[PDB]
Symmetry: C3
Subunit: 332 residues, 3 copies
């Protein structure tokens, strides 16, 4: 009887940060309430000033990470304001039935809807927009995110012992297909609808023009680098709603990795690089052992360093010479 | 002594259906006899009427699924009628030696051959044509299928308890590379041999023009949608002989998945999407919990919705509001 | 106290062969000393005489396989002679900190450096060059290899019983992006630096022109085919520093496979084909059961047979008719 369950309202935060939550459930099953507003907006995606008409959940690419526990109910109020121009909906890979909620959430500009589903399977899962006839266009314009459904007793290692993270980040990786004129210059459009047939043609090449973390080349660098300290346990959730990726922490490892993101399976240990298939979210747990700058990349290094799929961690603490040292510094 | 073993003759059926078989072996080891006839035929692959010269086992793309048990012998009579124009053969990834049988099965038009091999490893496996010097051309013209070698005691879950399916379907996914003229229009040819050098050039782009299930855009829709009922346990075998794919059931999950298709390994649990590498068959087990239409796709959504890699399930039964419900239907 | 540990100097050998080592460690932890010299050289990569300016560790593509045990220290002397023109460095995915050693190993022509790191995680791992601003160019010009860190008690199967190999080979798979003029002819350059902007443009297509094993189309064929005997246990280490691959032994299997190469995980059993993600090394163990020629390929068969990613094994011994036999040889 759902009306007897506690309700809790969560305010979402912008990626790569994640809203507050408990790893081990401190209550019984709850109805967890979320609100997202759809925003179509112009986004500058690279250093050259290339602009696209992005389609977003809550103003960001990716959409925010939602966190619940196994056998909670998720109740999402989805708002499509009349300042938008397109029909949108939402499909949760975490959910069972009705195209993951897609069939029940079709909202025209000026409409809203509220969907409830039971989170029956633990793991990280993609969510994305999926309107009839225009699915890849919405998804590859940025309209995707992820949801984490934790086991009620938190994460476990391959021997079933508790794994507790100190920090959690969400990296959403996005393949964009910006249309090009004859010479290879990127085209510009006044509205999302103008771009449609050119977008379809660009998509059919299967060759992205940009592949980015958190919505732009360089978004997770500088003042926006991810941070940690030596000794901290970090969980990095990574999603790709459309195309395969192969994350790698340069200078580190994935100590425990759920590459296809489903926590009832034992983690893979000591990964250098792992494959997250398009349409999947994965999670990797690492304990930092050395300070300094780390690069977190898609390890197709062209996709990383030429197309944009690279971010940074900045890690503070003590250097350990037993793990690595320069014996003879570069010299003639 | 093989002559003392029972022989059983199996008549194959057209994909996505599968010939009758027992999950748990009701006899000792047998010699299982199959016959396939090679057919080169014109195939219309999309809604626009694009035609290719397909190269098929038994008239279909994919070729039919063959089902045996571990330590059966498979005896295949392979016929290449004199109405064909090309040399063909067959390579079974299930088999050991002689290029998977490829070295022993080279048949010119007007010839036949009979190969026997022992099915020593349990799993789903690709089979495909592989003639010297023209391997990818035959395979990417449709000349591939799969064989399932069941354990003698049937399938097991991650804890070694029996898993029994009520229905089984075979989805063969095919990447086609249709040659294009200068402006991007698909070319037509009178015979398979005319297309050869143009086919090689189209293949070398590594960019398929079409990616389809069961031989055509829309083949597993409408009257040809896959069917099931709420509560039924369905095994979906999926093969890709040349290129990676990432299957996803829209509105469902892979409850138990052997993504690389080999049943001595424990299944992965609760998959949203899984990667089947090119040259592999995989299998996913799901119990339907909600009625309605489901889409089964390659979750590179461009490959799905623009290039053709999407089919439907139509599921009958009772709707469960505890799993999902519309709380507030789309409204102003 | 590292100064009290034994030191052992290893001389590396050319791929696909591997330097001598013990599977089960016969000593306590050691400092293992290696020397590599960087060589920029012209390489002919295909039958047509296409030449590139390759960037190599120790004169080969891939660089040599280094073999140590878990909790050894690796001390690498890296030499960049003044006959080279570029700055190089080395990143070990096996190592922890400083971009895998990349931040500490930047050597101009005429310089050398010595790096030490502790091999804390068992597995096969990529190493590659990674200079600031030119990472994918160096890697896709051939500047990558692998290192194997064995458990001190050798390899184990899925039940923890010893697995011992009789022979070990290293297959390095390389994606090249040779720039093309307007008509599609490959361009030639006097020096590595001349090619830079054309190389970047060719890389951004994400479409390799060649994909090769051991540095050239046909390199592992003929007199350079890999060899084994019926009954031998062979470990094949395979690396791809930039792009996914899907190895397959034509006529065989992967009996035990670590597709992402990390030995604390149980192996996958009975694989037909497995996916090694770009930026990863994997390892597959097979016992040969039949004599003859086998082809070892990337099972995107276009990449294999058109772009170059195919090699051969030649296996001697006795034919077993119980596993496979021609019942009726091809006839009218
Ligand atoms: O700014 N609207 O796409
Ligand atoms: O946009 N309706 O709340
Ligand atoms: O789905 N493309 O990796
Ligand atoms: O092809 N996926 O990077
Ligand atoms: O080790 N980074 O490519
Ligand atoms: O899907 N389990 O990582
Ligand atoms: O119809 N023969 O390709
Ligand atoms: O085609 N010979 O039976
Ligand atoms: O092999 N291409 O996914
Ligand atoms: O690249 N395979 O979809
Ligand atoms: O959830 N289907 O893309
Ligand atoms: O290959 N086992 O899914
Ligand atoms: O031969 N030097 O690139
Ligand atoms: O190149 N210095 O030894
Ligand atoms: O990273 N390309 O398979
Ligand atoms: O896309 N990797 O072959
Ligand atoms: O079975 N070789 O493609
Ligand atoms: O990464 N273990 O194969
Ligand atoms: Cu949308
Ligand atoms: Cu989806
Ligand atoms: Cu054929
Ligand atoms: Cu094959
Ligand atoms: Cu270099
Ligand atoms: Cu790397």
């Amino acid at each position: 009887d759902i009306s007897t369950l506690p309700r809790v309202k969560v305010d979402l935060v912008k990626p790569p940060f994640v809203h507050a939550h408990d790893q081990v459930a401190k209550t019984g099953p709850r109805v967890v309430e979320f609100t997202m507003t759809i925003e179509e907006k112009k986004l500058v995606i690279d250093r050259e000033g290339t602009e696209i008409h992005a389609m977003t959940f809550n103003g960001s690419v990716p959409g925010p990470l939602m966190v619940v526990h196994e056998n909670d109910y998720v109740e999402l109020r989805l708002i499509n304001p009349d300042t938008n121009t397109l029909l949108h909906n939402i499909d949760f890979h975490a959910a069972t039935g009705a195209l993951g909620g897609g069939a029940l959430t079709q909202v025209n500009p000026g409409e809203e809807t509220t969907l409830r589903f039971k989170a029956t399977k633990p793991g990280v899962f993609v969510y994305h927009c999926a309107p009839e006839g225009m699915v890849p266009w919405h998804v590859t314009s940025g309209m995707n995110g992820a949801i984490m459904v934790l086991p009620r007793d938190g994460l476990k290692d391959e021997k079933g012992q508790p794994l507790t993270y100190d920090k959690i980040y969400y990296v959403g990786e996005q393949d964009f297909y910006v249309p090009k004129d004859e010479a290879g210059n990127y085209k510009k459009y006044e509205t999302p609808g103008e771009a449609y047939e050119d977008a379809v043609k660009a998509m059919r090449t299967l060759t992205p023009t940009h592949i980015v973390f958190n919505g732009a080349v360089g978004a997770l660098t500088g003042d926006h680098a991810l941070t940690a300290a030596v000794g901290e346990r970090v969980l990095v959730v990574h999603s790709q709603a459309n195309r395969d990726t192969r994350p790698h922490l340069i200078g580190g490892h994935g100590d425990y990795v759920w590459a296809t993101g489903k926590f009832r399976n034992p983690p893979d240990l000591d990964q250098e690089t792992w494959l997250i298939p398009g349409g999947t979210a994965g999670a990797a747990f690492y304990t930092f052992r050395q300070p300094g700058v780390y690069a977190y990349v898609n390890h197709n290094l062209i996709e990383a360093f030429e197309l944009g799929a690279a971010g940074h961690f900045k890690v503070t603490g003590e250097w350990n010479d037993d793990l690595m040292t320069s014996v003879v510094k570069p010299a003639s």
